[PDB]
mmCIF file of C-alpha atoms and ligand atoms in Angstrom:
data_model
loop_
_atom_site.group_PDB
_atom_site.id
_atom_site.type_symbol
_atom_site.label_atom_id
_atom_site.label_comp_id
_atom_site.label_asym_id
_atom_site.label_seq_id
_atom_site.Cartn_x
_atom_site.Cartn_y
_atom_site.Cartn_z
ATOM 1 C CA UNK A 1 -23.624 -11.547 -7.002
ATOM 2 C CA UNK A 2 -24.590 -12.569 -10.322
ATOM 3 C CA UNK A 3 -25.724 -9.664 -12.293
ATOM 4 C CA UNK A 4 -24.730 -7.105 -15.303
ATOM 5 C CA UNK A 5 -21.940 -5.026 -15.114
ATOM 6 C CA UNK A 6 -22.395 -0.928 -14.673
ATOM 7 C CA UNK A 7 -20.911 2.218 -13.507
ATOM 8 C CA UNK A 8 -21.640 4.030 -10.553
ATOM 9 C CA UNK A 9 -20.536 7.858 -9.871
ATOM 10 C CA UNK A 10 -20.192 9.370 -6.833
ATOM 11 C CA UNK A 11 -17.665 11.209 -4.484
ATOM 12 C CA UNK A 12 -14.605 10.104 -2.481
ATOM 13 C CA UNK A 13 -13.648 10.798 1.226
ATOM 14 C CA UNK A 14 -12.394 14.279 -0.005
ATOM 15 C CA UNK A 15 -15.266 15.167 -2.060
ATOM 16 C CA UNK A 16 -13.685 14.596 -5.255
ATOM 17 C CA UNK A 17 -16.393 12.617 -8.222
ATOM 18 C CA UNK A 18 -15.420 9.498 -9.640
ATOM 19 C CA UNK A 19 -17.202 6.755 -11.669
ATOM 20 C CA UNK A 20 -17.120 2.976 -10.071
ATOM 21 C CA UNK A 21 -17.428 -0.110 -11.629
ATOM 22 C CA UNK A 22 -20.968 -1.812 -9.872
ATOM 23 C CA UNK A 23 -23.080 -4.788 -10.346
ATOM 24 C CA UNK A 24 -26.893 -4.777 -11.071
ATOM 25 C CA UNK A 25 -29.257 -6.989 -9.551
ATOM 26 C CA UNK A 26 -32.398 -5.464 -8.414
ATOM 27 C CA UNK A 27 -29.603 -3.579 -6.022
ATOM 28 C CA UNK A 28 -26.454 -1.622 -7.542
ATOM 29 C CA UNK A 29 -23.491 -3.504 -6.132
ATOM 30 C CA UNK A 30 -20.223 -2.101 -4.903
ATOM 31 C CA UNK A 31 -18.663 -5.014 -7.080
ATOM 32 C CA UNK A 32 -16.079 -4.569 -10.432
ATOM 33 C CA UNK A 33 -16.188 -7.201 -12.506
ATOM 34 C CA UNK A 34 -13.838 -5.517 -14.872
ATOM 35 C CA UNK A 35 -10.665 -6.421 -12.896
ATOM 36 C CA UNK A 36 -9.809 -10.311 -12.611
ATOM 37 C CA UNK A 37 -12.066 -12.828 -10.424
ATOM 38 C CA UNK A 38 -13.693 -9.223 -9.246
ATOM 39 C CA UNK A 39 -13.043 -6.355 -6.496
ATOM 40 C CA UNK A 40 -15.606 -6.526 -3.701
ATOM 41 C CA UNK A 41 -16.646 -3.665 -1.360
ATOM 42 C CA UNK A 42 -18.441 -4.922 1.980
ATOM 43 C CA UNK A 43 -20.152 -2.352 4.784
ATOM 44 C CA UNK A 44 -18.994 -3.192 8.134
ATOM 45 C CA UNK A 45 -21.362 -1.060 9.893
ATOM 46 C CA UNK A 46 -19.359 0.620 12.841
ATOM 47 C CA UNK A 47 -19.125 -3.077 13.642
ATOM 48 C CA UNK A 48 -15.923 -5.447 13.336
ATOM 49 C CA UNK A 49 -17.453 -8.769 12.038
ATOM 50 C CA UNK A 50 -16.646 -8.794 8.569
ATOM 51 C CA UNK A 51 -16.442 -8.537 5.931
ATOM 52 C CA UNK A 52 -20.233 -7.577 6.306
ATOM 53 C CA UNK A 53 -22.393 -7.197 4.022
ATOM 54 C CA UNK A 54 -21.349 -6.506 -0.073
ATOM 55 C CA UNK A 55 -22.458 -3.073 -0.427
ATOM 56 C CA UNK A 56 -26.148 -2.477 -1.781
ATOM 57 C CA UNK A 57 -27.132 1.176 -3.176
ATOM 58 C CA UNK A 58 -30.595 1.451 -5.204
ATOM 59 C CA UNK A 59 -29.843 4.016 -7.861
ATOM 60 C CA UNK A 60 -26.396 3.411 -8.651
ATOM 61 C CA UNK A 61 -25.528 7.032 -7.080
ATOM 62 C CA UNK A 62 -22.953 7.193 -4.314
ATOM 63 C CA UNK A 63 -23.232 11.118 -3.085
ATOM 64 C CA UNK A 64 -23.909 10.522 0.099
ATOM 65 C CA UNK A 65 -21.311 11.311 3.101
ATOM 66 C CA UNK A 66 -21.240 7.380 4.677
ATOM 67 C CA UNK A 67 -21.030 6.447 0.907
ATOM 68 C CA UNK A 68 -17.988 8.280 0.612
ATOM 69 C CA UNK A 69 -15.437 5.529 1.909
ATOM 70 C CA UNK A 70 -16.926 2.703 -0.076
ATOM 71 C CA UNK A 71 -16.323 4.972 -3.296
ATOM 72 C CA UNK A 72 -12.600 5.498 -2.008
ATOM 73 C CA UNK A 73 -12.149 1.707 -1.609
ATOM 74 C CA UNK A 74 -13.487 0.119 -3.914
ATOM 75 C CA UNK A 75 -12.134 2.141 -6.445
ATOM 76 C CA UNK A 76 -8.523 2.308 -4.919
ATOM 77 C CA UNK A 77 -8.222 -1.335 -5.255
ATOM 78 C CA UNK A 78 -9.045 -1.292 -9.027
ATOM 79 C CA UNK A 79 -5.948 1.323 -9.235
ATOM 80 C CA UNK A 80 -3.872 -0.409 -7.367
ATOM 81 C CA UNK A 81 -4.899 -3.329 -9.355
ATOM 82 C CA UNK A 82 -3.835 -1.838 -12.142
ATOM 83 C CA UNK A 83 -0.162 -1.107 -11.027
ATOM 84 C CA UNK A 84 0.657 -4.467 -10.630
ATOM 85 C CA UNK A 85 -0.940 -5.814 -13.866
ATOM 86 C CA UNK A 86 0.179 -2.661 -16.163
ATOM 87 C CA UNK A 87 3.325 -2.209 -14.284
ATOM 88 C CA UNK A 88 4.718 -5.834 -12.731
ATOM 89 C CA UNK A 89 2.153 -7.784 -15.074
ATOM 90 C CA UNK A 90 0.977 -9.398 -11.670
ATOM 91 C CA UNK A 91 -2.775 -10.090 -11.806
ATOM 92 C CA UNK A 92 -4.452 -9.519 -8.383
ATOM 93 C CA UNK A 93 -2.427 -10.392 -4.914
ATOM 94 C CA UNK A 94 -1.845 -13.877 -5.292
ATOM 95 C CA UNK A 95 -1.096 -13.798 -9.282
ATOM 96 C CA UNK A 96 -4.058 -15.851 -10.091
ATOM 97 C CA UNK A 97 -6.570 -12.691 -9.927
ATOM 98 C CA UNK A 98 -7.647 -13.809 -6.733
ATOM 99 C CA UNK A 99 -11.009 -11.548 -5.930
ATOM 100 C CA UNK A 100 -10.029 -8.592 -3.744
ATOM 101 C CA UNK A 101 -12.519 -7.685 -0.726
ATOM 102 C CA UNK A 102 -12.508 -4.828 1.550
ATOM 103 C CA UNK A 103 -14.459 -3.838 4.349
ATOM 104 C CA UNK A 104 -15.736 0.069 5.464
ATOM 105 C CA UNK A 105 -17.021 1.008 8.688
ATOM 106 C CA UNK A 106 -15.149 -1.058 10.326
ATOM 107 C CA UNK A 107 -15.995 -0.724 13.829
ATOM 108 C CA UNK A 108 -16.585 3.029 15.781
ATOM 109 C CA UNK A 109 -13.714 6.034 15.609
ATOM 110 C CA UNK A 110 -11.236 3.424 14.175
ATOM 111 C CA UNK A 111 -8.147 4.831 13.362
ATOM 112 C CA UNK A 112 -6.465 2.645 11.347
ATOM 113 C CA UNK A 113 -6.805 0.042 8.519
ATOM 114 C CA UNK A 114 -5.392 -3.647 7.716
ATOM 115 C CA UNK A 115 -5.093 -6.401 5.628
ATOM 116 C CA UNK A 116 -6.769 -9.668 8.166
ATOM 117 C CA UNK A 117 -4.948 -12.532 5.893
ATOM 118 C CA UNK A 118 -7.940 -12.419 3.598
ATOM 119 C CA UNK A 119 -9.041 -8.738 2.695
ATOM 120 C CA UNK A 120 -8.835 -4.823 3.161
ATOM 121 C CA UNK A 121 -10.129 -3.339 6.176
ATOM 122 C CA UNK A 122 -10.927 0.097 7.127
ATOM 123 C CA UNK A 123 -11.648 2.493 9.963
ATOM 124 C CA UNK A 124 -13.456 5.620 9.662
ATOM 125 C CA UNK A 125 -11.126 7.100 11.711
ATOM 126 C CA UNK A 126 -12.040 9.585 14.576
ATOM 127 C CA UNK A 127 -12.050 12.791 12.942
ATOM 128 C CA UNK A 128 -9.488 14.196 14.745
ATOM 129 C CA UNK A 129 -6.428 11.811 13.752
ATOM 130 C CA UNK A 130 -8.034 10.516 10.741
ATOM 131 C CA UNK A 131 -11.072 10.896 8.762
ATOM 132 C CA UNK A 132 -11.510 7.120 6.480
ATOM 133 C CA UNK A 133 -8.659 5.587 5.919
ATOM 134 C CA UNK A 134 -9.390 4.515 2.244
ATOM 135 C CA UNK A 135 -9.683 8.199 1.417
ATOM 136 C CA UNK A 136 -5.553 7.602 1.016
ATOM 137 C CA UNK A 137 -4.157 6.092 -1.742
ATOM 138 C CA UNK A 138 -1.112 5.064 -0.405
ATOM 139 C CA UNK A 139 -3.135 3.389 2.275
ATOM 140 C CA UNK A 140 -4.898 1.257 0.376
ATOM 141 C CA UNK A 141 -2.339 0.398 -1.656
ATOM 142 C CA UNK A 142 0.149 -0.557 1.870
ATOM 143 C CA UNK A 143 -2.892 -3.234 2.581
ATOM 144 C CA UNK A 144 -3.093 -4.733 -0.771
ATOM 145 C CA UNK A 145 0.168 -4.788 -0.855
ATOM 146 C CA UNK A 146 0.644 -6.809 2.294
ATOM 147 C CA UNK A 147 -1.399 -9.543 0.436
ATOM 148 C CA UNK A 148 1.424 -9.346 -1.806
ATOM 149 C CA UNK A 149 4.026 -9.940 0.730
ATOM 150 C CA UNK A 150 1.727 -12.880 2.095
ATOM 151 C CA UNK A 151 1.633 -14.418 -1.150
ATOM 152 C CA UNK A 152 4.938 -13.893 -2.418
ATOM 153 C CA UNK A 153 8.197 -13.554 0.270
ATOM 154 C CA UNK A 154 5.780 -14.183 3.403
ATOM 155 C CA UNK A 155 8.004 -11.962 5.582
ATOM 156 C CA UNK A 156 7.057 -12.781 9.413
ATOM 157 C CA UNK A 157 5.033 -9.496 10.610
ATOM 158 C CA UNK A 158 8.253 -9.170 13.251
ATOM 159 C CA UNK A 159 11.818 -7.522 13.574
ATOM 160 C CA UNK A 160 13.380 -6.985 10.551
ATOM 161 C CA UNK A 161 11.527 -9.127 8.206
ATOM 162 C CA UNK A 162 8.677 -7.216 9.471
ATOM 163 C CA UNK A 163 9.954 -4.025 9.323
ATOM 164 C CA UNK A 164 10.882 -5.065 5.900
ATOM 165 C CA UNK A 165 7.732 -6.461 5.702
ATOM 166 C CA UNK A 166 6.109 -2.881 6.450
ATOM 167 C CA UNK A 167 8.437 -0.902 4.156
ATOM 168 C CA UNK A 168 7.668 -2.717 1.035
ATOM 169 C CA UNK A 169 3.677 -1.911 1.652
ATOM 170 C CA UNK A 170 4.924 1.465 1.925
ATOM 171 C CA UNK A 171 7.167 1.951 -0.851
ATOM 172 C CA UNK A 172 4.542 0.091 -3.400
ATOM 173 C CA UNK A 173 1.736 2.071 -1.441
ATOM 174 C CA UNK A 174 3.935 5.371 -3.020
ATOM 175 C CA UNK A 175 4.219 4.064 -6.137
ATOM 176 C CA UNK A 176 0.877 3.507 -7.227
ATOM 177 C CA UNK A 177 0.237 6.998 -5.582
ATOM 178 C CA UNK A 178 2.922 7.830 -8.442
ATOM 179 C CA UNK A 179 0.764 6.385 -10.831
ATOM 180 C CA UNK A 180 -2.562 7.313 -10.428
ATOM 181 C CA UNK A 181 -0.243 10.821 -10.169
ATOM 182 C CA UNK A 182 -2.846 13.382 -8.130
ATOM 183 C CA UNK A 183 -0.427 14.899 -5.540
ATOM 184 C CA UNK A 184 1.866 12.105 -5.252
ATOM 185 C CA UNK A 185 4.781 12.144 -2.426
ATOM 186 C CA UNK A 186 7.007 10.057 -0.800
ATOM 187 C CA UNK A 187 5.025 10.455 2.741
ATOM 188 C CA UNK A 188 2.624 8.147 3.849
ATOM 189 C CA UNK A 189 -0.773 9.058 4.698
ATOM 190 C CA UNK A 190 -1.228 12.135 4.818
ATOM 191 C CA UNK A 191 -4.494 12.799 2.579
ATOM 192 C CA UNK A 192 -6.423 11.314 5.565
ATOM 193 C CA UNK A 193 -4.147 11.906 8.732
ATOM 194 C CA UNK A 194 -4.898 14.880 11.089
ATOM 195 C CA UNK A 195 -7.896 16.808 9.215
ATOM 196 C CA UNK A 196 -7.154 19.432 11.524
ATOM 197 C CA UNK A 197 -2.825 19.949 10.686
ATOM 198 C CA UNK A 198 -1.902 20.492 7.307
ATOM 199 C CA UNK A 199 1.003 19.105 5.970
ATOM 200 C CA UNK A 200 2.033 16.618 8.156
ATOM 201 C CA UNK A 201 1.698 12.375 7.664
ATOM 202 C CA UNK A 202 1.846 9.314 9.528
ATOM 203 C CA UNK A 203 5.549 8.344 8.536
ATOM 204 C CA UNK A 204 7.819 9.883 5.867
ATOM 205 C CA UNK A 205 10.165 8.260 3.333
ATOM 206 C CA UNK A 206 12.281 10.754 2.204
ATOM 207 C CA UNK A 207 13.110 11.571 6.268
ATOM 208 C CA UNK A 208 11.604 9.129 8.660
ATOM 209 C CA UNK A 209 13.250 11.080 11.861
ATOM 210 C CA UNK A 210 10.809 13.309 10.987
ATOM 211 C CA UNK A 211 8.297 11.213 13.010
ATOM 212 C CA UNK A 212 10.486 9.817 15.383
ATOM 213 C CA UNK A 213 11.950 7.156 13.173
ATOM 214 C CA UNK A 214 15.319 5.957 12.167
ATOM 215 C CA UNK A 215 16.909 6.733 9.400
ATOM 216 C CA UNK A 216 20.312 4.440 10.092
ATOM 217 C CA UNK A 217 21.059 1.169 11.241
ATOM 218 C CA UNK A 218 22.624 2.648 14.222
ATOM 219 C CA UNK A 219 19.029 4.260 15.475
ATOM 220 C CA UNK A 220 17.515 0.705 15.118
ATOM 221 C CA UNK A 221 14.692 0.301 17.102
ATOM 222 C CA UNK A 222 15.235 -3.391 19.605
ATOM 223 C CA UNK A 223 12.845 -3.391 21.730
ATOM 224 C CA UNK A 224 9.598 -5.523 21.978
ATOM 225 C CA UNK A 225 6.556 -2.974 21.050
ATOM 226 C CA UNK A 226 5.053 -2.636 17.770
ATOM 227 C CA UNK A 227 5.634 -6.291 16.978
ATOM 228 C CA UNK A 228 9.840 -5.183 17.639
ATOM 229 C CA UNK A 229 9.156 -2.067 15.692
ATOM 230 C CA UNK A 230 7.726 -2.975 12.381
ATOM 231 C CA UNK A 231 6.358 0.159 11.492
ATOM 232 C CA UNK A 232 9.397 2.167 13.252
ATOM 233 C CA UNK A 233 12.776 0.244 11.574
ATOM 234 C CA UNK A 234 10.691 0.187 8.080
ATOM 235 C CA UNK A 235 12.156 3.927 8.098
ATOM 236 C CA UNK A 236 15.474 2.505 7.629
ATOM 237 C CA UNK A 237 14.266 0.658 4.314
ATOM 238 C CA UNK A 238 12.067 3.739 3.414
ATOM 239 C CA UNK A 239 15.281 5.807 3.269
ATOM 240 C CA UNK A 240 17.249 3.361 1.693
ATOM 241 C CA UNK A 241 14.134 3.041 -1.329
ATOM 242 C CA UNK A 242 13.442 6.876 -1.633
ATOM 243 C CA UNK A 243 17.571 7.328 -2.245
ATOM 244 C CA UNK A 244 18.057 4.287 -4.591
ATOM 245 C CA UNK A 245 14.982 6.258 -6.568
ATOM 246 C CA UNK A 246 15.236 10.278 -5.774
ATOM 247 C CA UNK A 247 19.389 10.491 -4.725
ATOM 248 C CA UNK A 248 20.927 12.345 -2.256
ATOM 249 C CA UNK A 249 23.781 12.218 0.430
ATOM 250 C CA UNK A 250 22.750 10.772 3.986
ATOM 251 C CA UNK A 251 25.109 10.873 6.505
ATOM 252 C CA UNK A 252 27.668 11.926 3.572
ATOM 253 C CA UNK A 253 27.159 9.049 2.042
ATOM 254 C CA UNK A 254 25.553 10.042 -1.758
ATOM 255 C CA UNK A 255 23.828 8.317 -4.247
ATOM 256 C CA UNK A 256 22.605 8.654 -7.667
ATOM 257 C CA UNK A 257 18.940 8.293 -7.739
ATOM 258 C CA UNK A 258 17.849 6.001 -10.814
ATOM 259 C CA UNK A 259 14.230 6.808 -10.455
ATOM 260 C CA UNK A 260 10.694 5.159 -9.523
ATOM 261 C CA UNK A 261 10.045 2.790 -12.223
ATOM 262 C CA UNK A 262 13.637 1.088 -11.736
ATOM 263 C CA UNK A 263 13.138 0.995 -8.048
ATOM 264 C CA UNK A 264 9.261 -0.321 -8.270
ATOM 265 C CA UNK A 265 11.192 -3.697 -10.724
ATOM 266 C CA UNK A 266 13.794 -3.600 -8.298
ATOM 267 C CA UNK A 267 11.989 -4.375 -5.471
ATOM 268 C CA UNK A 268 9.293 -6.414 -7.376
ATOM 269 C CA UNK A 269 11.423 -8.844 -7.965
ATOM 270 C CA UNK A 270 13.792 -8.740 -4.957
ATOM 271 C CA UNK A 271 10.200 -9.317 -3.246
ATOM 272 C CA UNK A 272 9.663 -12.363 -5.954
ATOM 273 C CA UNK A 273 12.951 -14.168 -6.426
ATOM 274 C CA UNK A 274 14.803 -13.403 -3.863
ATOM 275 C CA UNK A 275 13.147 -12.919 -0.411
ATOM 276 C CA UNK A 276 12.083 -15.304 2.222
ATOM 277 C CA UNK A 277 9.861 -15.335 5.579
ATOM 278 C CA UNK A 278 12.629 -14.456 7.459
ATOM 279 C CA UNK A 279 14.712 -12.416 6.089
ATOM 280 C CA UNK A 280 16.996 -9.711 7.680
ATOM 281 C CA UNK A 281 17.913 -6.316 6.473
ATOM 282 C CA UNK A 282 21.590 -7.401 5.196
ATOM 283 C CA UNK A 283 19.896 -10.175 3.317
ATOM 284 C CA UNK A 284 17.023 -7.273 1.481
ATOM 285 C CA UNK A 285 20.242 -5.779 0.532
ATOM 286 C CA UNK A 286 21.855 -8.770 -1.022
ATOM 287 C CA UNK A 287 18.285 -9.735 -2.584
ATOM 288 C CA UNK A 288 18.019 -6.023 -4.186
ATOM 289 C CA UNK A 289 21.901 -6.167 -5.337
ATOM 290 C CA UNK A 290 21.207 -9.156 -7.001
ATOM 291 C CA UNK A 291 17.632 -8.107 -8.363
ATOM 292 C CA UNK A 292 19.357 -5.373 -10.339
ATOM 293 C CA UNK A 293 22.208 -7.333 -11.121
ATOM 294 C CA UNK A 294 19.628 -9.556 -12.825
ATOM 295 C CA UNK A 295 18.164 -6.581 -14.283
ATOM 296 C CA UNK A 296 20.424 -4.450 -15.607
ATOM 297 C CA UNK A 297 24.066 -5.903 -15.207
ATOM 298 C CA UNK A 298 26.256 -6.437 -12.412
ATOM 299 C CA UNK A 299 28.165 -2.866 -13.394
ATOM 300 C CA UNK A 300 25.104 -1.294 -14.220
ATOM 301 C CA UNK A 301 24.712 2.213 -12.256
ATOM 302 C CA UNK A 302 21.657 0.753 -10.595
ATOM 303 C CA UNK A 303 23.306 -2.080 -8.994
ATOM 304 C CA UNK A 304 25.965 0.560 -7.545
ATOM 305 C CA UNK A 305 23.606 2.802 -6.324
ATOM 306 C CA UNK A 306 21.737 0.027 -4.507
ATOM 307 C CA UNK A 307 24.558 -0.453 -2.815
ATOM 308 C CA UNK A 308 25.361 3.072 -2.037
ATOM 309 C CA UNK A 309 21.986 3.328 -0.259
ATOM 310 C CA UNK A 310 22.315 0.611 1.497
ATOM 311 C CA UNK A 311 25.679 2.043 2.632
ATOM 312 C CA UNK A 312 23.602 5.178 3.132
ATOM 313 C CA UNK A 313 21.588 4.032 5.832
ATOM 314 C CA UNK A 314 23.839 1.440 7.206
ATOM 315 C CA UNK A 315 22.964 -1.538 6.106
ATOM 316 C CA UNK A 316 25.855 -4.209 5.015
HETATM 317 CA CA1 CA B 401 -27.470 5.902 -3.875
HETATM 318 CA CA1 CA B 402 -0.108 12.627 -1.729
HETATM 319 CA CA1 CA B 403 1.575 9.670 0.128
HETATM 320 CA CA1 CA B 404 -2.996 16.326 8.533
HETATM 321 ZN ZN1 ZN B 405 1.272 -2.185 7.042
#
């Protein structure tokens, strides 16, 4: 839309008030034209042809309950956005500040969210296993960041490069919950998962067995569901991330953490220089080796302790 740039204020999924960046023509637009080529927030609906329509609101007042994802959404994606340009100096998804659209509503009782090769999409979930998906940070930051992945490494959504595929959208997903620091963790959606069971989430980092998934080579996952386990073997990466960043001894094998920030560079630019469509677990660990190398010397502490997480969780 062509218009003047204003702010909105209204309430996220969990009834917390934020203002939103909108655009004014006749209609208050769920569009910020304060980050890059713009960030574009669409209403699906409850229907699944998207994106739908850009999202229209009269008085510039987003209060209302089906409101309440849009907010989340749309102002995710300008945090998000904000990692990678403050953080990685990255502007947008494909580096070029490429617009960035996402859908809400999408479809009836959906209980999930994705990136479709072209933007953000987002159930409202069912109530009972989620309530909207963009009301988690680290959800909306996994789908950006898979346009990320598209743009940059391209790793094939299957086997390992997909399960490495999966683990970088969840590691950046935690580290821009990191950054805009309100209850950060290293577990993956749980501000949105099961409304009705506190403290649980839909995978964890710091211990993936915890739901079900591996946390060693060993326990790899080689069968033919979930695309050969993309969102299952990523646990073997997320373990390997959280210890390069937060220590500890798995399996007795320890490592000194070096913290968030040198992780996030790590893998930024293991996921820039150095990885390819297909590339295997062995060769993440080779690409993150040499990312640190690169970054901080090929004795550095931060190269050894790449490699001591690797060794961690199995990975050669
Ligand atoms: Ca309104
Ligand atoms: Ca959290
Ligand atoms: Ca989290
Ligand atoms: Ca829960
Ligand atoms: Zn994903």
């Amino acid at each position: 839309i062509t218009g003047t740039s204003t702010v909105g204020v209204g309430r996220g999924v969990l009834g917390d008030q934020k203002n939103i960046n909108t655009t004014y023509s006749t209609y208050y637009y769920l569009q910020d034209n304060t980050r890059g080529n713009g960030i574009f927030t669409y209403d699906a609906k409850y229907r699944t042809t998207l994106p739908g329509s850009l999202w229209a609101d009269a008085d510039n007042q987003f209060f209302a309950s089906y409101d309440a994802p849009a907010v989340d959404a749309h102002y995710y994606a300008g945090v998000t956005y904000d990692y990678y340009k403050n953080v990685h100096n990255r502007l947008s998804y494909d580096g070029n500040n490429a617009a960035i659209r996402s859908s809400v509503h999408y479809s009836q009782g959906y209980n999930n969210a994705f990136w479709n090769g072209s933007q953000m999409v987002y159930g409202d979930g069912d109530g009972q296993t989620f309530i909207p998906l963009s009301g988690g940070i680290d959800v909306v930051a996994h789908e950006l960041t898979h346009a990320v992945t598209d743009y940059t490494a391209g790793l094939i959504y299957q086997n390992e490069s997909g399960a490495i595929n999966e683990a970088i959208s969840d590691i950046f997903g935690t580290l821009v919950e990191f950054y805009a620091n309100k209850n950060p963790d290293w577990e993956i959606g749980e501000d949105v998962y099961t409304p009705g069971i506190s403290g649980d989430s839909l995978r964890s980092m710091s211990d993936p067995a915890k739901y079900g998934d591996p946390d060693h080579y060993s326990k790899r996952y080689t069968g033919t569901q979930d695309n050969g386990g993309v969102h299952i073997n990523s646990g073997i990466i997320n373990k390997a991330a959280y210890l390069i960043s937060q220590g500890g001894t798995h399996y007795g094998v320890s490592v000194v953490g070096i913290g968030r920030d040198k992780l996030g560079k790590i893998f930024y630019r293991a996921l820039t220089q150095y990885l390819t469509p297909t590339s295997n677990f062995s060769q993440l660990r080779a690409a993150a080796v040499q990312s640190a190398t690169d970054l901080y010397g090929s004795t550095s502490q931060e190269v050894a302790s790449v490699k001591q997480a690797f060794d961690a969780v199995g990975v050669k």
